[PDB]
Subunit: 53 residues, 2 copies
């Protein structure tokens, strides 16, 4: 969903820490997503997120 401004991804890594994901895992997700933050966020949200409830 349209972030609006763009230029860096550093700001989104911080938003992910707020969710509870650790910096190591956030980077590993980005790595495996070929730097794609949108894609990497989906990974974290499905695996590192509550896969129940």
């Amino acid at each position: 969903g349209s972030s609006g401004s763009s230029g860096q991804l550093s700001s989104e890594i911080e938003r992910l820490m707020s969710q509870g994901y650790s910096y190591q895992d956030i980077q590993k997700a980005l790595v495996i997503a070929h730097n794609n933050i949108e894609m990497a966020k989906n990974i974290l949200r499905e695996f590192s997120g509550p896969s129940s409830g």
Copy 2:
């Protein structure tokens, strides 16, 4: 490491079950990896695998 042949992907879902990844985990990774089995295998290998050890 190139597989050799192509025609199915289920052939790899079956191998991931052996590693201990659940049927759901395998699918969730494929969905987010845009059906890329290699990329999906990497997700499992850095998140569903031993983070430390």
